[PDB]
Amino acid sequence: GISRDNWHKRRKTGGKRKPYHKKRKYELGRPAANTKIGPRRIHTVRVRGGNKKYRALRLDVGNFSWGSECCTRKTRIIDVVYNASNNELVRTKTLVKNCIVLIDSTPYRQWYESHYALPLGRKKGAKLTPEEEEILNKKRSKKIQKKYDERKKNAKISSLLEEQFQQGKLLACIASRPGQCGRADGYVLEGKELEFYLRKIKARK
């Protein structure tokens, strides 16, 4: 029953308007269906023109983009760590746009060790199971043994990312509006944005 008209306000001078019609249908607004963390549940809406809006109520996965490596994989959303509008939305674990989430780094770890042949996020004791020994210590051909070592020089990672790879949980920021498209996509936090939101979460407590 919400109405997002402009005529229920005061004028710029401060005078109140006497209205000249009743609430029209194109002025409507619908309730906020806040997207929580759970197994997927979307409910389609019928909007103007007969089109569809995917009003998501629970979401569990969403594909994110490691920007500096051109790697887009579908991860598992874990948590909400910080929301820069309201902080009661963090204790309610609501997924909105531009909220910082914890994702699962395991699809990116499998891409990194497949593309660069370097162990990422392993402990110092380095218990290396044989099923990934064949991708970390493979048998290379004559032209491939130089190609992998040619890739291996610039295969460095900023150390703020590797501490997240140690525990398996990356920081990500949602860039799509889940209550309107039904998806929770986004990107992985890298660099200056990462060390901004890190100290925001640290000073939050």
Partner 1 sequence: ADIQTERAYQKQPTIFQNKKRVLLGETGKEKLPRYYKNIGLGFKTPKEAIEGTYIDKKCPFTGNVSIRGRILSGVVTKMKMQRTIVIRRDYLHYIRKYNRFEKRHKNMSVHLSPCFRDVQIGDIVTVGECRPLSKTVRFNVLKVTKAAGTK
Partner RNA sequence: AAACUGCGAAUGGCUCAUUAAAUCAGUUAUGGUUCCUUUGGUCGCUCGUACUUGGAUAACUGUGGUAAUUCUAGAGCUAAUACAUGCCGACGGGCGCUGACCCCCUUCGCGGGGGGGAUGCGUGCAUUUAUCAGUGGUGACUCUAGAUAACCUCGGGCCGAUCGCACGCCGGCGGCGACGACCCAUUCGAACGUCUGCCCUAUCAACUUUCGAUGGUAGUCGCCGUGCCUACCAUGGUGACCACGGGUGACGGGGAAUCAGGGUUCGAUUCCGGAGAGGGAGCCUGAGAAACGGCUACCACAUCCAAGGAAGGCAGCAGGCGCGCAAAUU
Partner RNA sequence: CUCUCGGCCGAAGCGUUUACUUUGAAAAAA
Q: Which residues of the chain form contacts with partner 1 (CB under 8 A)? A: 6, 9, 12, 67-69, 84, 98, 154, 190-193, 196-197, 200
* CB crowding 127-154: b at 16 or more within 10 Å, else e: eeeeeeeeeeeeeeeeeeeeeeeeeeee
Nearer to RNA, 115 or 156 (CB): 115
Which DSSP helix (H) or strand (E) runs through 66?
Answer: strand 61-66
Shortest separation between residue 78's beta carbon and RNA, angstroms: 18
Separation between Cα atoms, residue 198 and residue 138, nearest integer Å = 37
Shortest separation between residue 67's beta carbon and partner 1, angstroms: 6
Binders of RNA in range 99-138 (CB under 7 A): none
Query: What is the helix, strand, coil percentage profile of the chain, to 5?
Result: 30, 25, 40
Shortest separation between residue 125's beta carbon and RNA, angstroms: 28
Pick what 191 binds: partner 1, RNA, none; C-beta below 5 to 8 Å, kind-dependent: partner 1
Pick what 58 binds: partner 1, RNA, none; C-beta below 5 to 8 Å, kind-dependent: none
At residue 154, what are phi and psi to the nearest 5 degrees? -95, 25
Q: Taking CB under 7 A as the rule, does residue 154 contact RNA? A: no
3-class DSSP state of 123? coil
Nearer to RNA, 78 or 110 (CB): 110
Nearer to RNA, 79 or 167 (CB): 79
Nearer to partner 1, 54 or 82 (CB): 82
Binders of RNA in range 13-72 (CB under 7 A): 13-18, 20-33, 40, 42-56, 62-65, 67, 70-72
Separation between Cα atoms, residue 134 and residue 122, nearest integer Å = 16
Binders of RNA in range 156-195 (CB under 7 A): 175-183, 185-187
Residue 42, CA distances (Å) to 2, 57, 61, 179, 193 in order: 22, 6, 13, 9, 31
